[PDB]
Amino acid sequence: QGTFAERYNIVCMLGKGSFGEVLKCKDRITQQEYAVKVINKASAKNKTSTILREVELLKKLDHPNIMKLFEILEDSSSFYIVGELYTGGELFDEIIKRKRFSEHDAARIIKQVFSGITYMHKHNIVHRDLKPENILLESKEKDCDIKIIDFGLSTCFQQNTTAYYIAPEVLRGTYDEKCDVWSAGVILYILLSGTPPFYGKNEYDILKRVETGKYAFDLPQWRTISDDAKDLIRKMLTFHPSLRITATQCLEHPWIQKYSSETPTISDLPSLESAMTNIRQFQAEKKLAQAALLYMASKLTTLDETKQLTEIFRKLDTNNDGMLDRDELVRGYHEFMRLKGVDSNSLIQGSTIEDQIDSLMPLLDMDGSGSIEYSEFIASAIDRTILLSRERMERAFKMFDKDGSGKISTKELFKLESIIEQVDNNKDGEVDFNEFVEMLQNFVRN
Ligand SMILES: Nc1ncnc2c1ncn2[C@@H]1O[C@H](COP(=O)(O)OP(=O)(O)NP(=O)(O)O)[C@@H](O)[C@H]1O
Ligand SMILES: [Ca+2]
Ligand SMILES: [Ca+2]
Ligand SMILES: [Ca+2]
Ligand SMILES: [Ca+2]
Description:
Elements: H1 4-7, E1 8-16, E2 21-27, E3 33-40, H2 41-44, H3 49-59, E4 69-74, E5 78-83, H4 91-98, H5 103-122, E6 135-137, E7 146-148, H6 177-193, H7 203-212, H8 227-236, H9 247-251, H10 254-259, H11 269-284, H12 287-300, H13 307-316, H14 326-340, H15 353-364, H16 374-381, H17 390-400, H18 409-414, H19 418-423, H20 433-445
Antiparallel strand pairs: 1-2, 2-3, 3-5, 4-5, 6-7
The chain binds phosphoaminophosphonic acid-adenylate ester and calcium ion (4 copies).
Phosphoaminophosphonic acid-adenylate ester binds next to strand 1 and strand 3.
């Protein structure tokens, strides 16, 4: 587990749900800010080794529209789930403010809900309470990523203390992946019309409508919305779960494809060349360097540092799922050349873009998942000198400093030999901060 207090100080309360309270916390070394869910062990535990397993699975979710968790720590009283701090508030507030959204704006929002939800399901995670309250805006910035929160805990923990979004089958006690598609459908109905499809004076009347699956597009505002959007909603608000479309099919719907047709332009050329140069250099590093850089980028960077690359990531991510596949990387490189006025055929005079991406894929796809996930993209395409600030190297050092004050050669090896002899420049067995810094610099070096 971990020592929370050594690492973070508590800055303020952010929110309180039924599972625990969410606090703003600050890394004592980096000054970087984080959201922490504090879960009381004794009031809440329902299962601590089974909990650690499932939190591990939550931890490795790597997708732009899913809450990012960095670590789980533990005190004698509590678990501390440390994650990314989002400052845009709930999608719910954006609906109240805007009332309802153009087809273009609704499609862009719901596409991200679809992408995140598709990703969760492929990892055998059902949300169970998908609602605009449980989707946060990354920031107050204009076109920011939305982030799905508040899921994964239900088996491990007991809660303590809305009708609009629940699928009919949840009323019968069932909560399969289709219930999330229903909830997302209710959301889309709301984004486009501003009104819930199953609506009533109170909960009693609402549930009566949910139960029969009866809704319509009778409100006057529906006149001005395409049949494409209606077709999508209808597929999502299908009563029988087995006839209801999957999240993947939602994400692939022609209405979606039409309004999130994001694609590289000339204005993207500077950031695209940056990413490519960093990627080329990344691939040239040895495996040990690549792993430490990936570890460092994904644990220690900020949302503000990844924002240009996230835009590029989106423009390369043709099918809108949260990841880059091989063909997406090939097209991207081709498009990059075209925009620049360069003929891809010039590359022989000594291999094609295809050969190059194929040999790169094993290098960048570090978990062998078949796709380049967000954090693998960021680690490879960022300017890795950004990792070499003193505070970050100090936090990295400290992460591996399990015993006392220095990193044992016997720790570091089981925490990963050829390189170990080199970094230890005085040869006293253990690795101090100075050798650790030099090793990290060597990693960024080439
Ligand atoms: N990553 C985050 N960034 C900023 N605020 C957050 C973050 N996660 C949660 N919050 C806030 O903290 C509150 C509680 O979070 P939540 O994950 O819903 O708690 P919970 O007890 O696990 N589930 P619930 O009882 O349904 O609220 C939310 O209402 C948010 O306002
Ligand atoms: Ca993709
Ligand atoms: Ca991968
Ligand atoms: Ca050690
Ligand atoms: Ca030494």
